[PDB]
Amino acid sequence: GMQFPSIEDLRARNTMKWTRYGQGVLPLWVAESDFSTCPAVLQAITDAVQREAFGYQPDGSLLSQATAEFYADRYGYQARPEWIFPIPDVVRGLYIAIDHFTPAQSKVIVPTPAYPPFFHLLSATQREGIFIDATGGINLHDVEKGFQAGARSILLCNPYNPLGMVFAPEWLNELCDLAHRYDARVLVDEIHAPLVFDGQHTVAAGVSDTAASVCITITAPSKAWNIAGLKCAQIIFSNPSDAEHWQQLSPVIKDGASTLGLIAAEAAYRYGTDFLNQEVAYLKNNHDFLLHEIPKRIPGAKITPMQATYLMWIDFRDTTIEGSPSEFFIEKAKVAMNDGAWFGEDGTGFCRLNFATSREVLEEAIDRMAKAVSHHT
């Protein structure tokens, strides 16, 4: 089980999630969760503020060790802490990775539907994307065709949001062998890895010696422990040459993490596992509930079963809703989900629903939607 603040206290968090839409609209959109903050993480932040830890980051951080120990305990990956480094956030890590660890101007394979900031990542790095369809899984043949068309890296979310997918180890093994044959890198975004509820996360970088060479692994405790605004993520290298190359970069390229964020992240990794296990159990139950009920109450809605994350991709193309389903549900049901068109052109007609909230909130949301949809124009 999990604790939740009152709905009043949730709004009073005064984050993007609660300020984008009106007071009557239930927000099930941006990836922040509604769980009361993990007690160990909240206390670490509270104590740091009381201590006035507001200057520059201290020497002697054990965050890299904490990260390595978490990777070892949870996934059986023996990460080297000397190859783990702080960064402000996961997308900034991917930005540095493309800009400094792939050849200049080289195309980047981006599976779709894609985490919407990935399109901004392409514009920021000035790289052309090669888009491949990840719906129902990724075909390695599509990946090879991208490399044959000139791509020198692939961005791989694992777990794969917004589809809730957990890639198999032998699949990651062949992906890395393929990348190596084309002198390409695999940039693995593992921000959702703590949130697997049906299956097991495999760290791609550890499936082979080839994988260790081709992967650059990027993660944060920000999704699982809900501290995105504190700015602390981790870059996990799996070979000495990448770590050396990182160390040679100007500090200005690598800096940004917040002092409080370093403290919150370390506490999450060291003391947040019990909470994580309860969180994941609660998400699995919400998932099973939504998977059954949504199609029964909102006719034509289709959902594919998931294995990880709190983000549910719903197909509304078999409804007869006019225009964007997201906009319909905001205006007529007072329930906010992300419009799938932001994830790629083939996301049109889909919505992404955030189920990291209470069963009560989910019931209310689907009931509002069930009524509104019964007489949409």
Added chain:
Amino acid sequence: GMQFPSIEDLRARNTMKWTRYGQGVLPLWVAESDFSTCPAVLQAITDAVQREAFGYQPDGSLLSQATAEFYADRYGYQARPEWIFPIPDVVRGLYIAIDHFTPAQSKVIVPTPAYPPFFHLLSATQREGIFIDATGGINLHDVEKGFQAGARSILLCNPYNPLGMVFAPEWLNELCDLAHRYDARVLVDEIHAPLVFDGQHTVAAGVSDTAASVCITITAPSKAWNIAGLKCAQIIFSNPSDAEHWQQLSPVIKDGASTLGLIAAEAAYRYGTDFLNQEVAYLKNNHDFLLHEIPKRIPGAKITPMQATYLMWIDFRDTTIEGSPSEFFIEKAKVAMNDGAWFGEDGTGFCRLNFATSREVLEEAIDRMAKAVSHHT
């Protein structure tokens, strides 16, 4: 007057300042202050943590208005809030400014002695610096020669750290006219502007219509209110074309500010002025004390009177100390100051001393130095 935490509580802040050197070494180096945090700022952070404001930043921020109102009240500059934007920190703003608002590969005039991160800024942007001597002030003839040698921007700290200088308005006016004649930008770093204790800060961007076009102004409350680790600074544009160009940049280029940092910065600007005035009065007194006593107790040390900042540039070249004076004082006096060689090659023999601490700490520090220096090898 000002409050200070106990020396035990200062160490327990566990920031870079307190963790670089051993327990017996008084740290007067990195630019963090030892004042108890401004009560209004501390309470804003405390309340935000209690509210669990840990997700993404909210819509409807009034930080730009707060910044504009501070600029108006303190300096008489009527900044437009719609031209003010958040960034993670001041150096990141300068990085974006060089990379996106000056021509590709164009040289950058960097006065010396220089804030040490400026050398990392040059390596990160891949630009060659044209170094001019700022000791005793900046000669506009040296600036013109730089532009004639191809530079298309100048980095201008105003107030100028580490020399404590406050530039005159008619000087800023001619600098901007000069820059305009060479199609160059003036990138004004005003992070120390709240900390003028003898004179008045002029906002360069407001001295003329030409200045409004050529300047890009970058600041933060991080120095004056000691919140560098919270990651929130401001970019202040002074013409619509720059603001438009900023808005057209990929969000990935511009993001990074922390949620708590946005909250702390707004509180600093809205409610921190009384504290600021007491801080500045305390710094002026520390400055007057050090200016008189250092030369009397540490023979050969020379100091030029300052008008702003809490960073004192001390010349030890007329001592007969062997090797780096910074290293001598760390090893033999247990007092840590920055080695001037990090500020440029002509900084060798200088140290930078941070006097944003108690008179008690300063007395103890100069006394340790006075004894050690009496029999240096």
